[model samples]
Target chain A: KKRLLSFRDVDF
Target chain B: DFQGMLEYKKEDEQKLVKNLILELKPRGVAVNLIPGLPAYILFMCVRHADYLNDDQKVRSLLTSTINSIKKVLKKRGDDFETVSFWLSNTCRFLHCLKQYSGEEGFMKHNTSRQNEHCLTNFDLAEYRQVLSDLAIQIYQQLVRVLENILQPMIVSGMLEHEGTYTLDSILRQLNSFHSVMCQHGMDPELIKQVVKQMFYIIGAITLNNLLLRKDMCSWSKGMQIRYNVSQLEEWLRDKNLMNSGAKETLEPLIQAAQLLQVKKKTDDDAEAICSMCNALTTAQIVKVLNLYTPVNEFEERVSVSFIRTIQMRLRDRKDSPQLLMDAKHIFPVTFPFNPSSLALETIQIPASLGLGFISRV
Candidate 1:
């Protein structure tokens, strides 16, 4: 399962 | 069960847009910056920055704006500047359109109206002059909007960072009536109204997440279970019959339970649902009885358990290995083939392609 990325880690 | 799933961080650009919407809602306005003509020309320079080799300075500036909001290249400050520029341009453009709203003015004053609407030579001559002037004004405004937004950033000596663009893509499909009216030369206001209606229809069905996010409430397990039961009843009335999907969903709840460190009552109940084959309606009754074996006849209990496991193996992620194990358990019939294999590849192709020439040879 894919983990939710944090805002900073999230490129978008 | 948490609102955090949809929340944007304080520093993110999405948060800025969300805040802007909140601010605008009280004033009866909703803003969406999308791609395509009208909106497309507004954002084109920003979108094609790197591809602009021998383009004008204004075009280059437009490209920079597009990059500033991109996911990888964007800095947090870019959102502040972008929001400011867009708010000003949108206000001005909308103001001009509002100034030319009436039918009388549209006939005599509006160029786009006459050029598109009038077919006769006399009507065309009267409107064509104003139409050309209006086109120039609209073009100038587009360029002006671009310049006003980009000048400050350029003066500050800031360079754009490249990133993924997150704004929603625009839809061009319109209703047949709207298309016909637009072709016949209705005023921009009327055309805009038609487009808005199309947006509403498309938004409700194809883009249903907007409704789902608003209507689907996440609550504590006990409350959520009660809500789900009510929703399931509605679904049953509609003949959706998503009980099979619910069975798999229950398995997902069980997985989450394993992740939690303590024994949660909610998690335990969720696990029990995963283990049982009870229908959504039956599950509700079991909850009301405080987990006592359901009031249904005892004879049906065995069949329920078997059916639940069968559904689970097919639908649940946990049962993939189980499916692999059971794949060869049933014997194939030699005398009769299954319906899926009726079309044979190799047997039909060669004769059809080669025909009598190959047959005679």
Candidate 2:
């Protein structure tokens, strides 16, 4: 589950 | 809601040039030091032009004011403090145009003395629309600047307060940011959206860490997370953003903290954990259980069936497959028309704003 930051995956 | 009296020099174009000159000073007038002075003076300048019945003067004054603000923003676009300062002032500028607009809807809130200060020469409804358009533009920039300021800091900022110098500076940053918006007299609705984004970011990131790391899942860490997050919670009350869905944004993290404090060993306990973590996604709840840590040698490991019981309890539910939160989500922003009731004649521009040339209303 660890990963660099991204704005894409947030629950819409 | 607020008001400002406009003043104009006898010479239209020259006066506009002088106001623009001072406006272009090393630090433009869009600052929090003298809260609403820039808006007041600009509105005053409009009336000054209107008093002379120079329609071109009012037009030039309005255009030059917007253009000067645009020039300042072009230079200070990256400065969050400056951008938000302008956001508040620009909104106030728009409000000033509305209040003394000779429109009964806006004038109902105006003082009789303020009514006397109203523009008689021009119907500024067209310029009112222009000011609102610019205000929306500044508002967009304001939120974008805030998003950029907070994006990289959300997760690390929430976690950095583990001890020593690494502890929490993000809350301090947030507190100061809150103060900046408050002092600048921003619209409460606009301020609400800013904090909404802030709380959303903090909760999403903190919950993510609780899921990812064993170190932060301990009992005391739960207490600390509650304590840290509570400061932000209190801020919602201070700013009256409590009902803005910002606190709801913090709910998952709050549930995660509660998940850590309770026992996870019994059937009833599993039932309680499942019910208590209702705010959390299935993945976030299960992962926190998977990584639950003991404080000392005395505490027993969570038994396999205990964990299995939770899985079984969670078995029938379908939730997001992702365990981590998208800390970068932004609520779409809107600037509702907030007309100020403050009388322009009643404004007392502070000397700090450096506009000492005007006579008192």
Candidate 3:
């Protein structure tokens, strides 16, 4: 399965 | 004057005084009415200065306030209210001094000028001393309080599950000599003197801990930090510590990496590693995973390069061929796993590296 969106995408 | 809390040391006292003034205004709570209550006995007695006859009820209330103050000191082991009360009373006494000095007609015809003036000066000086003494005492009290709270919690053991004290983040602007002189006088070489004093007193953390534990923290930080034993020495020498406003003095110590390891080992049971271990494990896993790949169509490629491309893909992915997923979880997890440790400690010590002084001595 493709990797999910990581935290880098969100300004966390 | 409008003042931020940082600029005003007694912000709470200022607010309380303002509210009390408003409450005491005409048509507000009449002093005559409040004097009747047994609890307000002392307050009532003070109110009688302008009232018709000396009321016993008022005197009782005043005595009650004094007794309550003594109780607070005994229970808390510190006279917190005494500083505020003394300062307020001293200020009033000073005003009275000025009033009597300025208004000669208020004095009785037979009253000796020297006696009347002496009485006023005596009161003024006595109250001023009381104010100063209470101020110093409170500083000592606070230092002891901090030492008691910090040692067992920060040094010997983990803080007992209590919430972390929120650190004040507002940067105290370093005082400039020119601006300081605008308020007071200048002393050359004061900055070097201050820095030297600071180092002499604060070079060792253990010494600081001892001083604080003994209730000397207030004298050094709240009293001496401005004048002689602080980094901002030149700017603060002439100005009072209160004028600069007190803050938690944090010393930045340079430690030999080896020393930290030793200290860690010496206090092994007390060491905090949950957060540190998490980050370490995460980084290791990410590093290992980067060299490996998932069993997918492009499985042969190294995980590191794959994730790099994936990260870019996530960034650029908008069109129809855009990969719906962004950065690989392995790569994402790698950074987050031990991020704080990674940021703070670049390399792990092979052994606990205690300071050379402790190891040698």
Candidate 4:
């Protein structure tokens, strides 16, 4: 399964 | 009288020649000659730094222009209109430069002194804040308008096909353009990532919802029994015939691959063929349809999960009724179930007050 990136992961 | 007449004729002739030269000069050149023209020209160059070979020149011009504006403000502090006009112009021009200059590192590292000392000092506290706040709002509304124009048709189309959908890529580019443009004047990143990316995520969710839950694509089987025959699945694929020529070419092979799997009827795995179809169109494909501006790797998954979670929450909120049970069954057959597939069937005891259910398989 692909690891999901959440809103928190975004650098900006 | 004769001397006076000759002097007047000479003056008239000179005036005629001056007017002719003004008319003959290019509009830009004429504008350049106007008072404070150099500042305006510098601002223009800074605004359109992309056309020039050296970005540093634009940066330097921006700094000098700010310094000049500050000096003017110090002398004419009461000329709020002039000060406001200069501030607005600088704000707009700096925004342009930020969008164009491409360096991986954030913009804050190099221009701290200029940003704090020169740019901030010029603003007369209350008036400057009001101007900036208004400018921020104007920019946001403009961004929304641009996004609406780009995304509306794709959402309405309900087709996630790769072909003729070049608009998706164009939309992505346009979004990135907007993202860079608004924030670069960053020295405050207006339209910050959270608000902008959230809009994108919502749009993505809507597109994916349309793609996955279209009536022709996948129907909710009654009584918690989800079944999809080979032909039915084939029809589902055909119905979403928005595929490009290349995608259409690959469709037959994928269908053949699905047929090889011995899918069971009325079993939890009955939707496997449909799931396989879902998988065939990769997350990249869905993302292209969603056309988000940023480069997050797992955007599609997050969107899909969010979409599912929203549906789940809404269903959970509804009180115990026949509708609740129906909604439960509709919450079928996920491609990736949160809990194990086996636990899905396990009986759970419920309180009598919540409507008694024993051995709820």
Candidate 5:
């Protein structure tokens, strides 16, 4: 799920 | 001043603040609350202060409003819908002040009667600046709350084959996001910004998965990925957001799917791949072609030598050196000044707000 979590936790 | 000039009654003011607190939910009955109830009510108070011709009372009132709004919003900060509600309201409130500040530029929509609604005394330009800055804070909070809600459901639907469900789920999730923003009257420009940001995440997440998942690198898998990504494009187009720059965000992942489906055995295939896959980095193209899994009698693994030809052809072309997408990247958001077309003097305040003492003209 690292691929998905990157979208989640990443600062936008 | 006329004795019947009216007072900005404390009881009526408290009721307006109560209405603001109660109207935080951005759905159901309140969908079309005009420039929004909070703004209309706040503007009424400012207009009353103008009638009284008291600058000190105007400052005390809007400052009181800004604080009251802050307390409720801070406590319920995690709700995207509520945050969007206030963003729209605070923005509309800011616009109302500008529209009626006796400014010629803001007079486009004002009726002749509405001209009298313009502040007769005292300039509250500083308070408009304060509310404008407050709206920005509300906007930042809304996005953070919205971003947290958008994750996990989009997982693997872009990288894996769908249920008549995963693909449907992704579209449904987006449809929900679209509806919430529309229902709350979120700024159209801000909504487009949010759409592009989420589209970038979808691309980044899917491409990152394809880079690592060999099972996801098959020809049939490519067809599903292509089909799945098409639905997202259709949704964006259906919403008339074809020009939101969101489609380009998905370009690399879309090309990645094309790379998985196209013939990789011929020299002309190498040439086509080189030209068509410009959105993909050299590293990503090589990784995908190397990871490509062919099955059955007609298909074979992409030849190591064929990949070498691609590398040789791509040698001089400068593209991203990185193989993975940066999921965290965000486009800077813009808040275009959206002035209201509705005349302020003619707007109605619902009696449900219990402002019987504050009659509209």
Candidate 6:
């Protein structure tokens, strides 16, 4: 499955 | 004398006309029987200001009266419509006065003594204009804040994605969410629209940067296609007359870089040399080829570090190979001399052989 990320996932 | 004669003529004409009308209307009938005559006179004198001759004077008087009424309304704390009326009137008077009293020449030539005779002071005009300008700036800053709050999460997520694989679908979904959130917050529709456009412009830049940095995982054509899409977006904004120059400036270099990449096709020799030097697979080799074609100033720190890491790995593996060591020296001349002690062996052994031949010591 393709991995998904959202806006809150990254540390800036 | 002419003014006095004009006033006398008006009064004499009024009396004669009244006398004739009274006599013709039958004797003993009071002219007060004429319906609405008093009301008409009152309306003309008070509302229309029949005594004012010049239109400019009438406008000045009306504005002065409105300004005084606005002050009273403010003291009592008025509602929206009343405030809106005051604002409209204020704007109207500003437009009128600016024609004659706003510019440098007008301000320098202004007679303060004459202005003091008028109800609206220069201070009032200048203050109101400043208030309006400050209000506009406040609203703009508020909208910017709201935009940042909404877009923060999406930006963070995009940055977290591995290999910068944040897709277009994800960006669009986030944008849609932003619109919904803004609507829920009861934002001004026009302001929301403007902020969204700005957000998309930012997204375009981010997307381009991600693609450029991860060209190993993606093809050059794919990256170029994304840049083309961004250019189309700019065109769309231009068509709607919402395009800002900031986005265009940000994207120009990316577009130019993509075009440069598109033109320079890598040969087999270039790919093979880069792959061997970097000890990389096909994709990483393509990335190296891309980097090789790009100007040194455009080179990013991450790419530079990766290149250095690969070279270090190679040197560690081939520490004893004379031909490989010589080849490595060609690539990094300044630092290669410090890498291996094998070069020191040559200098030291040659000197020792010369000392043995001399055999004198």
Task: Name the candidate that leads on lDDT.
Answer: 5
Top TM-score model: 5
Report model 6's TM-score to 2 decimal places: 0.29
| Per-residue lDDT over B72-175 for candidate 3, one digit per residue giving the tens place of the 0 to 100 score | 44555442233223323323333332233324443333234222321211112332243334434433443343233333323121111113331111012123
Q: Which candidate, 1 or 6, has the higher lDDT?
A: 6
The CAPRI class of candidate 2 is: incorrect
Q: How high is the CA lDDT of each candidate model?
A: 0.26, 0.71, 0.26, 0.30, 0.73, 0.32
In Å, residue B101's CA in model 2 sits off its true spot by 2.5
User: Per-residue lDDT for B129-159 in model 5, tens only?
Assistant: 6777787788777667766766565555666
The DockQ assigned to candidate 1 is 0.02
lDDT of 1 by residue, B1-361 (tens): 1110011222343333333322222112122221111222222221122122222322223223223323221222233223323323333223222222222443344444322321111111222233234333333332333333333322111111111211111111112333333333233442333233322222222112211222221122223333333432343234333332322323322222222212223444445544452322332222222322222353112234433443443364332221011111111111110011111111111222212221110
lDDT of 4 by residue, B45-87 (tens): 3323323333343334333444444455455434323332343
Write the residue-wise lDDT of candidate 2 on A1-12 in tens digits: 111111111211
Give the runs in model 1 whose Cα sits over 4 Å from its true position. Answer: A1-12, B1-54, B71-73, B77-223, B226-361
- Candidate achieving higher TM-score, 1 or 3: 3
Tell me the deviation in Å of residue B335 in model 6.
57
Share of the reference A-B contacts seen in candidate 2: 0.00
Candidate 4's C-alpha runs over 4 A off are: A1-12, B1-123, B156-188, B191-205, B208-213, B216-361
Per-prediction TM-score, please?
0.20, 0.74, 0.25, 0.28, 0.81, 0.29
State fnat for each of the candidate structures: 0.00, 0.00, 0.00, 0.00, 0.00, 0.00
Positional deviation of B54 in candidate 1, in angstroms? 9.3
Collision pairs in model 2: B1-B340, B1-B341, B2-B340, B4-B344, B5-B44, B6-B44, B7-B44, B8-B48, B161-B167
Those runs of model 3 whose alpha carbons end farther than 4 Å from true positions after fitting are A1-12, B1-68, B78-122, B155-361
TM-score of chain B of each: 0.20, 0.76, 0.25, 0.29, 0.84, 0.30
lDDT of 2 by residue, B1-361 (tens): 3334446444554444445333433244444445566777778877766766777666666777777788778888888877887778888788777777777787776667778777777777766666777877887787678767666666665554643222245666777788888888888888888888777877886788778777777777788777777777776677677888888888889998888889988899999998888888777877887787888998766788887888788887777777888876667776776766666656666555445555453
Superposed by TM-score, candidate 2 places the C-alpha of residue B40 at a distance from the truth, in angstroms, of 1.9
Which residue pairs overlap in candidate 6's backbone?
A6-B157, A7-B153, A7-B157
DockQ (Cα-based) for each candidate: 0.02, 0.01, 0.01, 0.02, 0.01, 0.01
CA shift at B319, candidate 6, in angstroms? 38
